[PDB]
Amino acid sequence: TLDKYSSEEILPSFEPVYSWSSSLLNMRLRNISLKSEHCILSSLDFQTSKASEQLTKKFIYPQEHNSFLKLNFQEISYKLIDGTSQIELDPICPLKVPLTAFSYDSISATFKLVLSTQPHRVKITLAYELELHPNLKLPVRTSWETEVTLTSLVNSKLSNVKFKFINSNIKVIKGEKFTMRLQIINSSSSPLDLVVYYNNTINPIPLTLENQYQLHNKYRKIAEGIILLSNDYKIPVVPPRETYFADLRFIGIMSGYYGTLSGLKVLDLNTNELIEVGNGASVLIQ
Amino acid sequence: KILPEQPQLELLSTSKMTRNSWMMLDGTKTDFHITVRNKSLSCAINHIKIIPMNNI
């Protein structure tokens, strides 16, 4: 609008028109995995922080020699997020969700969730209220997001054959003959002639006496705790890309917990391996 | 074209199997459990149909 502006410009007086020349509580999450059950236990834990102790005697109750807070947790929510999605996740044990708490307190909550290359996204929301005197109450609605960041099957060396017991965990009264089905998955190239055997021999010890006798007792218990009624078994044939059930029969004579039992070691009669398949068994004989 | 969300399944586990391998004795029948989880956080499937299918 230069024309309409310059036409509204106020011309000066005595001049020609134109001239040519010129944080009460602190909290964390200590999740732990479990490949035994293919699950991760995410355990949050929140405790009254040192700031609460500092402010106890400054404003809340300065005249008292020893005061304590009255934080009432109205809700402790654990949720999983996937974009806009949001779903609650219950805890293992019940939690009395209107939970009263005083100074120097700490509460833990453990949530189980299924376990590769896709980390989770968890929202933890604490809504509580400090309950100074019966009448007035100061609420807080804090929340925050993060990510859930952090043996039974046995393989063979220099091959691809795989071993597993159908029931790795079994309990049975002492002296009753039982059985554990050893599945032998062959997929490499060719049939095997592997042979199973159990040696009831005290392995020679290699150290103070406290370690030495512990170690000797360990081998003695291993050697003469359990026996295999089908020792020196010839597994008949396991053709390639097939499975076999080396059904074994045992009996125990010395009560205990033979977790990852040794002695039982199937050896391959093709390259003289000593693959220790005993690690897949966790017998408990009463 | 932009659809609504769709969920996913993963085959969490099978009870009496190891790497999806097992034997029969040519005449004995057996049974086991298949454990599957719905990975989606919002959607819920209202249809499932199972068709067995074999090598022969």
UniProtKB/Swiss-Prot annotation, chain A:
UniProt pathway: Glycan metabolism; beta-glucan biosynthesis
Source organism (scientific name): Saccharomyces cerevisiae (strain ATCC 204508 / S288c) (Baker's yeast)
Note: Present with 1660 molecules/cell in log phase SD medium.
Single GO cellular component term: cytosol
Function: Specific subunit of the TRAPP II complex, a highly conserved vesicle tethering complex that functions in the late Golgi as a guanine nucleotide exchanger (GEF) for the Golgi YPT1 GTPase. TRS65 plays a role in the YPT GEF activity of TRAPP II in concert with the two other TRAPP II-specific subunits TRS120 and TRS130. Involved in cell wall (1-->6)-beta-glucan synthesis.
Annotated compartments: Cytoplasm; Golgi apparatus, cis-Golgi network
GO biological process per UniProt: beta-glucan biosynthetic process; cell wall organization; intra-Golgi vesicle-mediated transport; protein-containing complex assembly; retrograde transport, endosome to Golgi
Superkingdom of the source species: Eukaryota
Protein name, entry field: Trafficking protein particle complex II-specific subunit 65
Keyword set, alphabetical order: Cell wall biogenesis/degradation, Cytoplasm, Golgi apparatus, Phosphoprotein, Transport
Portion of the full sequence shown: 138 to 560 of 560
Subunit structure: Part of the multisubunit TRAPP (transport protein particle) II complex composed of BET3, BET5, TRS20, TRS23, TRS31, TRS33, TRS65, TRS120 and TRS130. Interacts directly with TRS120 and TRS130.
Residues of the signal peptide: none
Swiss-Prot record, chain B:
Entry's localization field: Golgi apparatus, cis-Golgi network
Protein family according to the UniProt entry: Belongs to the TRS120 family.
Other observations noted: Present with 259 molecules/cell in log phase SD medium.
Function description: Specific subunit of the TRAPP II complex, a highly conserved vesicle tethering complex that functions in the late Golgi as a guanine nucleotide exchanger (GEF) for the Golgi YPT1 GTPase. TRS120 plays a role in the YPT GEF activity of TRAPP II in concert with the two other TRAPP II-specific subunits TRS65 and TRS130.
Subunit comment: Part of the multisubunit TRAPP (transport protein particle) II complex composed of BET3, BET5, TRS20, TRS23, TRS31, TRS33, TRS65, TRS120 and TRS130. Interacts directly with TRS65.
Protein name: Trafficking protein particle complex II-specific subunit 120
Lineage of the species this protein comes from: Eukaryota, Fungi, Dikarya, Ascomycota, Saccharomycotina
Segment of the intact protein contained: 842 to 897 of 1289
